[PDB]
Paper text:
One of the major facilitators of [name] activity in bacteria is the protein [name], which promotes pairing of an [name] with its target mRNA in solution. [name] bears an α + β fold that is the signature of the highly conserved family of Sm/Lsm proteins that draws members from all domains of life. [name] of [name] and other eubacteria forms a compact hexameric toroid that presents two structurally non-equivalent concave surfaces for molecular recognition; these faces are referred to as the proximal and distal faces, with the former exposing an N-terminal α-helix. In this study, we describe the structure of the [name] [name] in complex with the full-length [name] protein of [name].
Co-crystals of full length [name] [name] and Salmonella [name] were obtained that diffracted to 3.48 Å resolution, and the crystal structure of the [name]–[name] complex was solved by molecular replacement using a model of the structured hexameric core of [name] [name] (i.e., lacking the C-terminal residues beyond amino acid 65). The asymmetric unit of the crystal comprises one full [name] hexamer and one [name]. The fold of the [name] is consistent with the pseudoknot structure predicted from solution studies and sequence alignments. The RNA bridges two adjacent [name] hexamers in the crystal lattice, effectively forming a distorted sandwich with a wedge-shape. The [name]/[name] structure reveals that the U-rich tail is bound in a recessed channel on the proximal face of [name]. The electron density is not well defined in this region, and there may be disorder or multiple conformations of the polyU tail, but the features do show that uridines U61, U62, and U64 (as well as C63) each forms an aromatic base stacking interaction with the ring of F42 (distances provided in Figure 3—figure supplement 1). On the exposed rim of the proximal face, U24 stacks onto F39 and U23 packs onto U24. In our structure, R16 and R17 make phosphate backbone contacts near U23 and U24, while R19 and K47 are not interacting with the RNA. A more extensive and potentially more interesting interaction occurs between the duplex region of [name] and the rim surface of an [name] hexamer in a neighbouring asymmetric unit. Although poorly ordered, the C-terminal tails appear to be making distributive contacts over the surface of [name].
Numbering used by the authors:
A (entry chain F): 2 to 71
B (entry chain E): 5 to 71
C (entry chain A): 4 to 74
D (entry chain D): 2 to 72
E (entry chain B): 1 to 70
F (entry chain C): 3 to 70
The structure:
Amino acid sequence: AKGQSLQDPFLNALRRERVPVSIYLVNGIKLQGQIESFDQFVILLKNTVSQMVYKHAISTVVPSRPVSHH
Amino acid sequence: QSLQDPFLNALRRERVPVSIYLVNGIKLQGQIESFDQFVILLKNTVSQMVYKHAISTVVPSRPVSHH
Amino acid sequence: GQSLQDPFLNALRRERVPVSIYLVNGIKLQGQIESFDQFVILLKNTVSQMVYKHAISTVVPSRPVSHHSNN
Amino acid sequence: AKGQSLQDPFLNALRRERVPVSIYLVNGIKLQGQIESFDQFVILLKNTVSQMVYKHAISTVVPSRPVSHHS
Amino acid sequence: MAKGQSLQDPFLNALRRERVPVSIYLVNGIKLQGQIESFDQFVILLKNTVSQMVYKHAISTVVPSRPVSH
Amino acid sequence: KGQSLQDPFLNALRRERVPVSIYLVNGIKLQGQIESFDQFVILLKNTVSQMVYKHAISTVVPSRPVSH
RNA sequence: AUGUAGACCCGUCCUUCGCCUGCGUCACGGGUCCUGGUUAGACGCAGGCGUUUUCUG
């Protein structure tokens, strides 16, 4: 089969369940918060404020607890 | 679904002071004067063009009003 | 349109080969490839973490793998 | 504000008015000179010599004076 | 002569075919070495002790040990 | 309506066999002559030909002045 | 003898975001070539819309 898209479902499940995540940027910096919303190119990450994070600056998104899409 | 643009227009319109962190760790500050698919014009003492491909994060001083 | 990237990654995933993923900033991740898409890889160790391919330099499998018996 | 509206008009105004600029690269290096000409993908920067700077390596272009321009 | 533009794939294919030992320098300064086993639009498979997959977007230069004739 | 100078500039350097320095994004300086080049790569000749990805280059600077 | 043709040559008349559409402009003298060869592009003006960089410029 087509091989199913895994970036938008994964992020959406984190967003919907308000899972706390750590976002590591390419320069080593670690952001934390909850995924508020996201778009093809950015992610809105909410902690004390909403900050807009470019996907092209992200290395990894690692959730506090396991999340499943199917 | 576009929110980069709704999120960046709102900061511009409201003249919200922002911090822009670059991929190399540098922190820029100012107000978003105007901003496009490939750059953002950031105004402090002078207007300086900033390439979006060099930005990691845009973080506003004061929360901006979104849905 | 053609790729050896998808064929190579899928074999690692299917066989549950332990891999090391080196990022562009020098950081080394390890785990098994759980799934992947055009733009990311899900890497499983203690938890599943999502790794952007544009942050990866190399994927190096822990144990060598088959040619796929290519003709 | 839609499409590439600010990417090339701003550069042209610098180029035409021979405004001295500073170009900061993504690795922290600071170049200075006058924009001589620009492609979609590069900028020619003139000081003692003309050097070709890839845009993908640039973080910011900051002019010496706010352009004596519409803005 | 005449041509289609690309020399990136002919150059790589010649190295692969001739089993030329190469050095691949990554954008972070790391030096990889081996032989080019195969490659696609986006990656190169580099063989030493094991076959590892190298993203082209991480590569700065490919420099062959000895002459390649295109 | 604009112009393309990236591929005229290179191609003048390659034709005139001008010495050049290519600075990479990581600070490394390569030197040589442009031999062949492409949408995404430049072939740089010194003791051997090496293939340099454009996406790794910050600047190309000629030893001697030339026209765009 | 060389064209009710064409492609080049010579001479005379301060580039810049893309794209769709509509309107116009790309001329005049002379020269070479027993001539793979093209159906498009460029500039002017009007109107409209705009991939938001997530795997090589």
